[PDB]
Amino acid sequence: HPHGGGNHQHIGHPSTVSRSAPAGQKVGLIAARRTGLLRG
Amino acid sequence: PQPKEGELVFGVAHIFASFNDTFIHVTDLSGRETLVRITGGMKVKADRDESSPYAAMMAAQDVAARLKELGVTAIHIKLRASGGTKSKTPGPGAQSALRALARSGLKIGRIEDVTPIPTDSTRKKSGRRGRRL
Amino acid sequence: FTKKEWYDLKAPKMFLVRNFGKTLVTKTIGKKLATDSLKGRIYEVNLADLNNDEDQAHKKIKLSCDHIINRDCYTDFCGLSITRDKLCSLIRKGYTLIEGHTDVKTLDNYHLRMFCIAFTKKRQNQTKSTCYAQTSQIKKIRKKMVDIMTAEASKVLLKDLVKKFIPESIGKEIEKQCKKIYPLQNVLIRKVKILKRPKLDISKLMELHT
Amino acid sequence: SAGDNINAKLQLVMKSGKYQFGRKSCLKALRTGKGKLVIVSSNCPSIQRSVIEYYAMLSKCGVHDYHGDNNDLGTACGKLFRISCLVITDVGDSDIIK
Amino acid sequence: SRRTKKVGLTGKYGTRYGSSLRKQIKKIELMQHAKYLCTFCGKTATKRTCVGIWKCKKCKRKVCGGAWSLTTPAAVAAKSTIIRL
Amino acid sequence: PKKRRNGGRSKHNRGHVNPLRCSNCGRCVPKDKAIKRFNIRNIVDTSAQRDIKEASVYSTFQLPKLYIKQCYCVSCAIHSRFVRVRSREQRRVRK
RNA sequence: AUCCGACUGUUUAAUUAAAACAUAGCAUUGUGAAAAGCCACAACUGGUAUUAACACAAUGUGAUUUCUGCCCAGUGCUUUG
RNA sequence: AGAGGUGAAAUUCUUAGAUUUUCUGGAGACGAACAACUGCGAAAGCAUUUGUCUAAAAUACUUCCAUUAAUCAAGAACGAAAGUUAAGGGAGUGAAGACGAUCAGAUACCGUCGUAAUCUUAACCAUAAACUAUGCCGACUAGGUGUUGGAUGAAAGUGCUUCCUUCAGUACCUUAUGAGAAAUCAAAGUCUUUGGGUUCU
Numbered sequence: 001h002p003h004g005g006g007n008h009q010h011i012g013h014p015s016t017v018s019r020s021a022p023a024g025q026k027v028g029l030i031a032a033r034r035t036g037l038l039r040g
Numbered sequence: 041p042q043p044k045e046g047e048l049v050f051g052v053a054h055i056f057a058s059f060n061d062t063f064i065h066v067t068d069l070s071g072r073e074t075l076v077r078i079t080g081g082m083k084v085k086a087d088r089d090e091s092s093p094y095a096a097m098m099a100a101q102d103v104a105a106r107l108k109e110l111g112v113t114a115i116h117i118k119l120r121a122s123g124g125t126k127s128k129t130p131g132p133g134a135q136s137a138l139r140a141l142a143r144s145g146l147k148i149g150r151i152e153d154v155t156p157i158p159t160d161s162t163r164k165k166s167g168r169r170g171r172r173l
Numbered sequence: 174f175t176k177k178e179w180y181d182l183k184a185p186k187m188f189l190v191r192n193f194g195k196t197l198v199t200k201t202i203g204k205k206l207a208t209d210s211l212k213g214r215i216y217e218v219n220l221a222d223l224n225n226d227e228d229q230a231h232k233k234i235k236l237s238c239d240h241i242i243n244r245d246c247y248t249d250f251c252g253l254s255i256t257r258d259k260l261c262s263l264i265r266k267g268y269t270l271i272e273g274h275t276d277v278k279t280l281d282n283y284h285l286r287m288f289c290i291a292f293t294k295k296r297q298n299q300t301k302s303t304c305y306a307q308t309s310q311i312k313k314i315r316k317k318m319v320d321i322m323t324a325e326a327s328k329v330l331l332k333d334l335v336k337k338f339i340p341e342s343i344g345k346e347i348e349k350q351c352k353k354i355y356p357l358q359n360v361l362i363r364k365v366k367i368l369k370r371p372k373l374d375i376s377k378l379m380e381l382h383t
Numbered sequence: 384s385a386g387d388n389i390n391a392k393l394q395l396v397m398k399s400g401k402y403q404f405g406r407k408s409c410l411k412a413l414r415t416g417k418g419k420l421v422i423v424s425s426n427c428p429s430i431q432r433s434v435i436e437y438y439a440m441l442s443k444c445g446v447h448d449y450h451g452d453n454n455d456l457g458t459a460c461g462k463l464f465r466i467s468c469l470v471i472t473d474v475g476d477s478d479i480i481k
Numbered sequence: 482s483r484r485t486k487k488v489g490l491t492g493k494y495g496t497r498y499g500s501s502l503r504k505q506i507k508k509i510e511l512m513q514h515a516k517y518l519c520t521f522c523g524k525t526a527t528k529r530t531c532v533g534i535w536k537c538k539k540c541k542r543k544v545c546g547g548a549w550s551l552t553t554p555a556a557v558a559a560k561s562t563i564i565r566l
Numbered sequence: 567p568k569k570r571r572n573g574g575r576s577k578h579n580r581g582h583v584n585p586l587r588c589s590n591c592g593r594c595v596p597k598d599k600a601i602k603r604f605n606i607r608n609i610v611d612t613s614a615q616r617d618i619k620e621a622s623v624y625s626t627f628q629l630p631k632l633y634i635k636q637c638y639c640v641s642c643a644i645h646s647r648f649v650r651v652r653s654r655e656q657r658r659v660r661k
Numbered sequence: 662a663u664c665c666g667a668c669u670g671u672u673u674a675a676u677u678a679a680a681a682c683a684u685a686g687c688a689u690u691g692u693g694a695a696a697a698g699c700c701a702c703a704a705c706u707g708g709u710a711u712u713a714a715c716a717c718a719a720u721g722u723g724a725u726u727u728c729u730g731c732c733c734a735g736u737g738c739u740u741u742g
Numbered sequence: 743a744g745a746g747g748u749g750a751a752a753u754u755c756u757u758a759g760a761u762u763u764u765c766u767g768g769a770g771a772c773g774a775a776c777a778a779c780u781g782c783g784a785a786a787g788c789a790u791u792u793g794u795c796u797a798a799a800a801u802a803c804u805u806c807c808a809u810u811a812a813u814c815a816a817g818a819a820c821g822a823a824a825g826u827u828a829a830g831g832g833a834g835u836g837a838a839g840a841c842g843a844u845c846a847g848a849u850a851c852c853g854u855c856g857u858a859a860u861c862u863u864a865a866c867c868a869u870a871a872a873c874u875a876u877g878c879c880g881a882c883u884a885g886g887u888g889u890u891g892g893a894u895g896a897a898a899g900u901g902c903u904u905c906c907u908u909c910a911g912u913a914c915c916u917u918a919u920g921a922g923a924a925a926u927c928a929a930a931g932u933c934u935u936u937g938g939g940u941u942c943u
């Protein structure tokens with residue numbers, strides 16, 4: 001998994017990935033326009 | 041145009057006075073096809089006096105000159121006062137604009153008040169206890 | 174930029190002047206036919222300039238153009254209004270005003286709203302300050318207004334309805350037929366909204382212009 | 384209101400008059416020509432009411448569709464069960480027929 | 482005697498899952514296990530058999546309804562709209 | 567103390583009255599307590615009015631009026647002198 | 662009495678059974694379809710799918726209670742021409 | 743080619759077209775003017791049209807019953823705004839927060855943005871200058887001017903208005919060998935000439 005490993009259980013890379021990434025790599029939030037709590 | 045002898049060409053002038061600036065906008069009698077717009081704040085540099093009578097006078101003179109160059113000789117008047125949830129009375133420049141237009145040389149057709157009053161009343165700015173000075 | 178040409182505006186033969194101004198438009202360009210820019214415009218005229226008498230200085234008339242011969246537009250009927258200051262001058266403190274609206278269809282399958290308005294009167298032998306009416310009387314009056322509008326409008330035709338608007342016959346009938354409930358002062362049709370038109374037929378439209 | 388009128392008239396029949404409710408009773412009465420008025424509830428099943436109204440048409444008796452339910456009609460009388468149909472064989476001091 | 486003060490029906494869940502979750506469960510399962518009027522036969526004997534099927538114990542008619550109640554307001558409103566027209 | 571019999575407004579036989587908003591400062595005031603002024607004014611003054619007459623078509627023209635119906639709160643009203651402070655006996659003088 | 666994990670459950674066959682994994686609850690992201698989302702295949706063709714947003718797919722946190730502050734300069738993702 | 747906004751300005755938007763005018767669609771809240779020392783409700787509250795349920799007075803009565811009543815520890819129903827839980831909705835306003843100004847300082851008054859909230863459905867909470875700062879029932883004591891809803895009796899009428907009398911709401915003015923410390927009061931009067939009934943502090 002792209003999120004595996006480390007000494008503290010963190011991701012270590014931005015979790016929003018682009019629409020064009022190959023199959024074994026699109027694993028976080030796919031082509032997200034926005035993150036965080038919605039306020040409307 | 042090609043007017044016959046003794047018959048006039050009319051336009052509609054939309055006056056807008058709002059305690060901060062003064063618009064003078066002239067179209068044909070359909071609303072579309074705007075002709076002139078001088079807006080008053082193009083005649084001073086002080087960021088105040090934009091609503092002064094002098095600026096409205098200069099704007100009206102410019103409107104009259106361009107209108108005479110275009111071929112229009114008569115004017116209908118629709119007066120506005122910015123009145124939505126804001127103030128319902130026209131600003132200080134309206135009288136100066138009207139008088140300058142009347143003394144310009146144009147013929148005046150009809151006068152109307154078209155301030156957008158609500159029967160509806162969305163809530164007004166500066167909630168209760170008002171604007172405190 | 175001003176490379177523009179002028180056209181003439183013309184009104185149907187119900188009115189009297191038939192030539193009430195001019196309009197501008199930009200010359201034709203590729204796929205810019207210069208007549209798809211003119212048709213559908215709305216013009217609002219005072220009706221004291223349409224019939225040449227100052228008694229009807231209120232009652233603005235809305236006219237809309239549909240068909241364009243070479244340099245003319247033909248501009249048939251679209252709506253009504255009442256010139257706000259006239260409305261404001263009719264409202265004083267001590268009286269009560271009645272108001273109602275309805276939907277109606279003509280024999281040509283036009284759809285409209287009509288928006289009447291009314292006020293109460295004095296019956297001078299009274300020597301009292303106010304002229305208020307009870308709610309039940311108001312309900313009866315309003316029902317009468319709605320029924321009379323429906324009959325008068327659904328009875329005949331669009332052109333005849335327009336000819337009926339000019340001398341304010343509907344107000345006279347409403348006022349006469351409501352005298353037994355409470356005397357009423359000046360009664361007017363305040364606004365007509367055209368709601369749906371059947372179909373554009375050029376022969377009829379040009380029949381309106383002889 | 385018509386419902387209130389019919390409800391008022393029913394109580395007079397109950398206090399003075401002769402009646403019996405149930406399907407077999409109604410068919411038995413119409414068969415022998417002893418019925419004056421039938422009353423069926425709006426909830427009555429489809430093939431019951433056709434038989435009721437065919438017996439009535441043959442026997443020349445009136446029907447009067449009730450405006451209520453199984454429970455409403457039984458509460459209209461003083462009963463604590465649901466009825467769905469009844470027959471009056473003797474109108475008492477009431478004028479329910481006219 | 483009264484065997485329970487508050488929890489009533491949800492006393493089978495013991496002390497697990499938290500109190501507010503048990504409260505919502507109680508609200509839902511009061512509706513789910515009730516008896517409803519059968520408008521066809523007049524008796525109050527209609528009970529749920531599956532997540533969307535309701536059957537009358539007496540006349541045995543099957544009606545499609547909601548998940549925890551026999552009717553839902555959104556369908557009641559639409560049906561009333563159409564019947565009014 | 568208790569300087570007014572009506573408490574500064576005209577409310578009787580009622581519990582609550584909906585408020586309106588001051589035309590000058592935006593404050594909320596109940597309707598039965600604001601001072602109401604209805605003004606009929608002219609578009610222009612008498613000098614510029616006769617300049618419009620002689621530049622006009624129709625040879626007999628009447629300029630329209632304006633109708634405003636302003637309403638004020640107590641503070642925003644007595645600072646502009648629509649209403650003044652009076653003596654104890656004169657406070658009771660209405661109309 | 663103190664620390665950890667809310668609880669029942671699972672794990673390094675043959676040195677580690679735990680505070681590790683799972684879990685209900687909470688939040689975020691993509692997609693109106695056989696010219697769509699995510700994934701398989703050399704090519705032809707397939708899986709979800711006997712499906713259709715109260716659905717399918719991709720992540721994070723980890724019962725209940727009470728809370729969830731400030732920063733869009735950097736690196737990512739995304740919108741207009 | 744500027745627009746906003748202010749005491750004066752800044753922050754802000756704008757040739758990728760702002761502001762301004764004209765037309766066509768959708769969305770959420772709100773119901774101006776009429777509108778008052780006017781109406782209804784136990785209080786909190788209640789204002790666009792039409793329909794269906796549902797109660798409540800007041801008046802009229804040569805209808806029925808015949809003491810069935812007044813006030814009420816414990817107990818019960820309802821109870822503005824804010825606030826809490828869940829699902830929706832989400833234009834305007836806008837606790838928090840971020841900026842721009844004034845100031846010695848300004849975490850404020852002014853200005854530009856703006857999150858919860860404000861609206862609907864299902865549940866909680868039980869408080870306000872929730873004020874007429876005046877508990878409820880009954881009797882008596884003074885003149886005038888009005889106004890909202892009935893009824894009786896008389897005149898100007900194109901079975902309708904004006905006047906008179908009377909009952910029930912509701913205000914105001916004048917004056918009290920009446921009262922108060924006074925302000926003032928038609929009850930806050932009929933109290934050392936002190937006791938009609940009753941609950942709370």
Ligand SMILES: [Mg+2]
Binds near residue numbers: 002
């Ligand atoms: Mg890797």
Ligand SMILES: [Mg+2]
Binds near residue numbers: 009
């Ligand atoms: Mg972790």
Ligand SMILES: [Mg+2]
Binds near residue numbers: 173
């Ligand atoms: Mg001050």
Ligand SMILES: [Mg+2]
Binds near residue numbers: 581582
């Ligand atoms: Mg209050």
Ligand SMILES: [Mg+2]
Binds near residue numbers: 666
């Ligand atoms: Mg464990």
Ligand SMILES: [Mg+2]
């Ligand atoms: Mg275990």
Ligand SMILES: [Mg+2]
């Ligand atoms: Mg091992």
Ligand SMILES: [Mg+2]
């Ligand atoms: Mg071991």
Ligand SMILES: [Mg+2]
């Ligand atoms: Mg864990």
Ligand SMILES: [Mg+2]
């Ligand atoms: Mg999870």
Ligand SMILES: [Mg+2]
């Ligand atoms: Mg925890």
Ligand SMILES: [Mg+2]
Binds near residue numbers: 733
């Ligand atoms: Mg960034």
Ligand SMILES: [Mg+2]
Binds near residue numbers: 781
């Ligand atoms: Mg009223």
Ligand SMILES: [Mg+2]
């Ligand atoms: Mg919510």
Ligand SMILES: [Mg+2]
């Ligand atoms: Mg918003």
Ligand SMILES: [Mg+2]
């Ligand atoms: Mg704002």
